[PDB]
């Protein structure tokens, strides 16, 4: 048929009975670094089974008065096994992700999500002259959440979490130009994206620069009658594809 997929990687396997097609990047597939493009002077390491598997982040509860969530992508995987340990001892590293997000309801709930993967998402601070700090911009495997109300001026370093501006001062209706998919509980259950390495340099450090951002925004809010199940969780799974590193050093 055309509804079932079964993507496997390493020693894990993600299967879905009801899902739409997969959307892949800007039309390219994540391959290794060719020798014409490289600039480092040593030989890279490719674990290739120890990293390429589906790590699973924490889950979030989709309430009725929800706003949205975002993750910074080469930062949520900082503590997830052999990817988080090869990211600390090395200095460089390129990746390609395979994002997968799944949220199930019955034939009686209604609602619609938007799953987008934004490259180079600079966010805006609360005060117009300050900049947001690290602890309030991302979390280790924990989703930072938007609001439906404009953040007040009394805060010093907090992110502007107005959802209709999507944090970046841009209209939220135009966010579909990035690679994206829709979760719609009527006909769909799981969204899946494949993101190649998008950066202006052929390799980059991974602790100073989060070069992707997975945003999830509910346009049509969740709604049901009394008697249905009230707790609907969302759970995202990310797997790095074709990763490699350079430049050994001490731990940090």
């Amino acid at each position: 048929s055309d509804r079932v997929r079964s993507i496997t990687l390493g020693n894990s396997t993600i299967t879905t009975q009801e899902c739409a097609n997969v959307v892949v990047g800007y039309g390219v597939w994540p391959e290794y670094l060719k020798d014409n493009e490289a600039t480092a002077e040593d030989q890279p390491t490719q674990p290739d089974v120890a990293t390429c598997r589906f790590y699973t982040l924490e889950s979030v509860q989709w309430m009725k008065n929800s706003a949205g969530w975002w993750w910074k992508l080469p930062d949520a995987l900082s503590q997830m096994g052999l990817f988080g340990q090869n990211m600390q001892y090395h200095y460089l590293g390129r990746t390609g992700y395979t994002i997968h997000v799944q949220c199930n309801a019955s034939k009686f709930h209604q609602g619609c999500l938007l799953v987008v993967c934004v490259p180079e998402a600079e966010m805006g601070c609360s005060n117009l002259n300050n900049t947001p700090e690290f602890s309030e911009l991302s979390g280790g495997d924990s989703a930072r959440m938007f609001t439906d109300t404009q953040v007040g001026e009394s805060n010093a370093k907090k992110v502007q979490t107005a959802v209709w501006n999507a944090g970046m001062g841009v209209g939220v209706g135009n966010l579909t130009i990035f690679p994206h998919q829709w979760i719609n509980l009527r006909t769909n259950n799981s969204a899946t994206l494949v993101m190649p390495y998008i950066n202006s340099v052929p390799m980059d450090n991974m602790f100073r620069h989060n070069n992707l951002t997975l945003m999830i925004i509910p346009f049509v809010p969740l709604n049901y009658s009394e008697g249905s199940s009230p707790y609907v969780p969302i759970t995202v799974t990310i797997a790095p594809m074709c990763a490699e590193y350079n430049g050994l050093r001490l731990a940090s």
């Binding site: 097609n21 998402a121 130009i177 994206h180 620069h209």
Partner: protein, 267 residues
């Protein structure tokens, strides 16, 4: 580079439905108007020439203007080269994430007399010097100094009443493309300022008079004009909706999506 034409159609009734689809898969539909009605075979002669990148960006725009008084100490203008200060040009650049272009700098220099006190003033034609300093070179402090002349930095000498001066600058960067946005700090301890990159530094511009204070102060004014050529853009981006407030960061104040109307059916 003509656009596609349109082919005629007949009234069908069958199982192949071209109009019903599913936007869940992130696939924008590729239907033609020949699938939902009856069309005629229209020879189509339009052109998509003016929508290309090299016709959208290669137009000159002002970036900055500074004034400097002849009769002063430290009367001269310094300006670090960056696109972020005007707003009509900046919004055109943030449509794309990674850009790559050379540059054709052009200056329009005008002068004006200040209310002097001396009697029967008369000055000959003036001379301006526009010095370009790459990032790292020694910069001058006062106007009467020997670091202005005795240097191998590429400067340009101009006198009034002629065509405006123009120099060309190639792609001076360390990466492979200018980064319009940089999510992530510049220090490995993740402290300090947020979106500051060292990938699109081009240098400063030092401008000053060459003549001396004869009898009356002259206040000049110089505009700077970009012109990106040979431009290649990558990874498009939605256009900026809220107003800019600062040149370094991207901070803003929230505002609604659009201006409102009275009722959902009001035309």
């Amino acid at each position: 580079a003509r656009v596609a034409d349109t082919i005629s159609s007949r009234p069908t009734n069958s199982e192949s439905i071209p109009a019903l689809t599913a936007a869940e898969t992130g696939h924008t539909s590729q239907v033609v108007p020949s699938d939902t009605m009856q069309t005629r075979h229209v020879k189509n002669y339009h052109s998509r020439s003016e929508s290309s990148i090299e016709n959208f960006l290669c137009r000159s725009a002002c970036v900055y203007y500074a004034t400097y008084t002849n009769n002063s100490k430290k009367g001269f203008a310094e300006w670090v080269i960056n696109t972020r200060q005007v707003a009509q040009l900046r919004r055109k650049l943030e449509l794309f994430t990674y850009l790559r272009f050379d540059l054709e700098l052009t200056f329009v220099i005008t002068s004006a007399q200040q209310p002097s006190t001396a009697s029967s003033v008369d000055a000959p034609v003036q001379t301006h010097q526009i010095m370009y300093v790459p990032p790292g070179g020694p910069v001058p402090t006062k106007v009467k100094d020997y670091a202005w002349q005795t240097s191998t930095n590429p400067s340009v000498f101009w006198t009034e009443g002629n065509a405006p001066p123009r120099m060309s600058i190639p792609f001076i960067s360390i990466g492979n493309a200018y980064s319009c946005f940089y999510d992530g700090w510049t220090q490995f301890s993740r402290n300090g300022v947020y979106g500051i990159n060292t990938l699109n530094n081009m240098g400063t511009l030092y401008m000053r008079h060459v003549n001396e204070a004869g009898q009356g102060p002259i206040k000049s004014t110089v505009r700077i004009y970009f012109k990106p050529k040979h431009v290649k853009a990558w990874v498009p981006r939605p256009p900026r909706l809220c107003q800019y407030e600062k040149q370094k960061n991207v901070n803003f104040s929230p505002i609604g999506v659009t201006t409102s109307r009275t009722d959902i059916i009001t035309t």
